[PDB]
Amino acid sequence: PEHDERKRLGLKTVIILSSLYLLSIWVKKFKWAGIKTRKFVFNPPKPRK
Amino acid sequence: AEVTQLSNGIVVATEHNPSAHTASVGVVFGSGAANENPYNNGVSNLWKNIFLSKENSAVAAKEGLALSSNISRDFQSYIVSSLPGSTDKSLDFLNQSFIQQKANLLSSSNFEATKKSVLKQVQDFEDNDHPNRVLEHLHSTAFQNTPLSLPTRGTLESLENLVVADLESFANNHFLNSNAVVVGTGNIKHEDLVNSIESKNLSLQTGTKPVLKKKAAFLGSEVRLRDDTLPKAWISLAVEGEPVNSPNYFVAKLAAQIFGSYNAFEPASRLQGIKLLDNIQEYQLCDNFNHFSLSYKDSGLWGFSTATRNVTMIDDLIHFTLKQWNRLTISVTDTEVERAKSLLKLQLGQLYESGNPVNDANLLGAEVLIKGSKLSLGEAFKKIDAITVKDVKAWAGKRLWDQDIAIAGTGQIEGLLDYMRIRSDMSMMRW
Structure with a gap:
């Protein structure tokens, strides 16, 4: 019996949830942006310790 | 009484102190370690350290002069300090050093004894002076790929790559009059210096x-x-x-x-x-x-x-x-x-x-x-x-x-x- 509502609500659930997914992704690369583009360099050091 | 400022080509500035036991004269070039470039870094700290190499500093040591020098980021200075009466003893020794002499300090025995000491210099700093070391790199990253970044005392890298042909490359461009100011501090008058300055002729690279x-x-x-x-x-x-x-x-x-x-x-x-x-x-x-x-x-x-x-x-x-x-x-x-x-x-x-x-x-x-x-x-x-x-x-x-x-x-x-x-x-x- 629930049928027509069930897809109705289903509609809403997905549209919102999809958007969150894509929105969440974006956000993630932002907060990671410093670590992703983070870049090291090596310079061996004079032997005395 | 309110600091003096008059220009006849050479912008002459002074500041009087009646309770000073001594005084000082010198020049300030309005271009410092941030007018340099990636691979000539430390050229301005190299210039400072020949200026105080035993040669020129033994000259002014019989005369009773003491020399002072420092490089900043936006600016660059060359100061000499002595008793207030020997005020011509300053101005002349300055004149010798910056228009008269050129290759007398720029020896291949001088310059390879200064650069082999501004190299030990910038190798105790980045080695054991962490608070400034940290402080210096702070500029390097905040102002990365831009004027202020270059450490004032210059990288040990661009400091072993530099010969006298490079000390000059910066000199003859940025050691001008239209970028400098002569200073009079301590126990001297404005009418003592700007008199003793218009007393001397010549002009180095005018219009530049x-x-x-x-x-x-x-x-x-x-x-x-x-x-x-x-x-x-x-x-x-x-x-x-x-x-x-x-x-x-x-x-x-x-x-x-x-x-x-x-x-x-x-x-x-x-x-x-x-x-x-x-x-x-x-x-x-x-x-x-x-x-x-x-x-x-x-x-x-x-x-x-x-x-x-x-x-x-x-x-x-x-x-x-x-x-x-x-x-x-x-x-x-x-x-x-x-x-x-x-x-x-x-x-x-x-x-x-x-x-x-x-x-x-x-x-x-x-x-x-x-x-x-x-x-x-x-x-x-x-x-x-x-x-x-x-x-x-x-x-x-x-x-x-x-x-x-x-x-x-x-x-x-x-x-x-x-x-x-x-x-x-x-x-x-x-x-």
């Missing part, structure tokens, strides 16, 4: 301007020199500050003044009326800190600098501090501001009113270059005091709150956290 580069800029960034073999941890942090001759030049120096400067050892320091201090002291989060608002012609650096033997708890150290900085925008006590205005003045004094002529030179030379004249203490104070709280709450509101920072450091900084933490503490959660 020194050249320009892409104006400096700022970008939120880090650079970390971890070294777990060094007993402490040194960190310096900041935002895009305020330039010399910026509307908030003083507003910003007042802010620095509030949180100020700590030394966990001097019991005097432990009692300062600084709010932040309430936190830091509980567990002894650090050994010392200090703030600043470094101002340069094109851009500035408001932040602070700390050393600490406390490695597990650095993460709070940076936290308590950057949170305090938030108050400056949202909740600074007026009665804090007064203690600032008050203390700024005392500091700004011992800066400007020290009984040492050499300082009053660079101060004068740099300022009378950038804005033309100097600004009097009464002028400064008249500004400092005008400053309301709203002064400080709108300056932090643009400059401090939620803006990119610029961290750098070395020693045991594994505990020093990451960039999305630190940077995030620039704000506080609101409804």
Whole structure:
């Protein structure tokens, strides 16, 4: 019996949830942006310790 | 009585002191270690160190002269100090060194004994002077790929790649008259120097301007020199500050003044009326800190600098501090501001009113270059005091709150956290 509502609500659930997914992704690369583009360099050091 | 300023081609500036036992003369070139380039770095500190090589400094040692030199970022100075009466003994020895002589100091036995000592010089600094080392790299990353970045004393790299043909390449471009100012400090008159200056003829490369580069800029960034073999941890942090001759030049120096400067050892320091201090002291989060608002012609650096033997708890150290900085925008006590205005003045004094002529030179030379004249203490104070709280709450509101920072450091900084933490503490959660 629930049928027509069930897809109705289903509609809403997905549209919102999809958007969150894509929105969440974006956000993630932002907060990671410093670590992703983070870049090291090596310079061996004079032997005395 | 109000500092003298007159130009006959050579802009001649002086500042009299009737209670000075000595005086000093010299030049200030309005182009410093930030008018250099990536691979000629340290050329300006190389020039300083031939100028004090035993050769030229033994000359002026029979004469009774002492020479002073320093390089900054926007500027560059060459000062000589002696008794006030031997005031021609200064001007002549200056004249010899900068228009007469050229290759007498530029020997292949001189220059390969100076460069083989400005190399040991910049190899004790980056080796054992971490607080400035950290402080220097802070510029390198905040002002990356831009004028201010180049360390004043120059990279050991671009400092073994430089011959005399390079000392000159910078000299003949940026050692001009239209980029210099002659200074008279201590115990001499304006009519003693500008007389003894128009006494001498000649003109070096007249009409010539020194050249320009892409104006400096700022970008939120880090650079970390971890070294777990060094007993402490040194960190310096900041935002895009305020330039010399910026509307908030003083507003910003007042802010620095509030949180100020700590030394966990001097019991005097432990009692300062600084709010932040309430936190830091509980567990002894650090050994010392200090703030600043470094101002340069094109851009500035408001932040602070700390050393600490406390490695597990650095993460709070940076936290308590950057949170305090938030108050400056949202909740600074007026009665804090007064203690600032008050203390700024005392500091700004011992800066400007020290009984040492050499300082009053660079101060004068740099300022009378950038804005033309100097600004009097009464002028400064008249500004400092005008400053309301709203002064400080709108300056932090643009400059401090939620803006990119610029961290750098070395020693045991594994505990020093990451960039999305630190940077995030620039704000506080609101409804």
